[PDB]
């Protein structure tokens, strides 16, 4: 048994089937009130909400699924004959993110492919069938999202207008991707500031005690 998959049960328990907003919630009450996860949480999925409404992108790349919110939080908008790709690189993870969408109902708009960004990006246009990407939402392994940005660059992913957005920049932190997007002027960059909550979590002190200089 994982924290992933009792928030998936906490989910099946107190959601109604077929209800995307019910799932989106289930999930951010257990996450904040239950058992501490990685998640974006609904202040930041207003921002998300806000973004999918300004540019209505049809084909939709994720990076990172973890447990689904993300995905059911972005494929609730989309409209019909739009897909979301989301890239998992857990297969359990994968797994809960599938049983999350067909909770929600969600399911006929994403396809999770399980694997490695690195390894997957490269496949999209020729087994994906894959032109150019309306918008990416990067949320996977910190220190990835430069390089990963650059391989969407060269695999000619990413079309004027396509619309980056990642999260956690600041915390952990992604400062090379940020100093990147933001120096290049192939990148028009807008920073949205929100919040992380902490809840009964394991913490520490460090103590150090100077021995002299060496
Ligand atoms: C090279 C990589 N390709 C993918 C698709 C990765 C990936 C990361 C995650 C989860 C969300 C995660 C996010 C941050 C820290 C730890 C775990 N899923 N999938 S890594
Ligand atoms: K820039
Ligand atoms: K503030």
Sequence with gaps: DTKEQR?????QQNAKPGDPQSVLEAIDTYCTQKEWA???????????????????????????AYCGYSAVRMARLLQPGARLLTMEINPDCAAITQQMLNFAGLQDKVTILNGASQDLIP?????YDVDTLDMVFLDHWKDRYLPDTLLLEECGLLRKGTVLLADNVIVPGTPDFLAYVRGSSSFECTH?????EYMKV?????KAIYQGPS
């Design 7 to 11: 928030i998936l049960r906490y989910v």
């Design 38 to 64: 990685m998640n974006v949480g609904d202040a930041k999925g207003q921002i998300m909400d806000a973004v999918i409404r300004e540019y209505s992108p049809s084909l939709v790349l994720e990076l990172g």
């Design 123 to 127: 496949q999209l246009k020729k087994k």
């Design 192 to 196: 949205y500031s929100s919040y992380l």
């Design 202 to 206: 394991v913490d520490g002190l460090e």
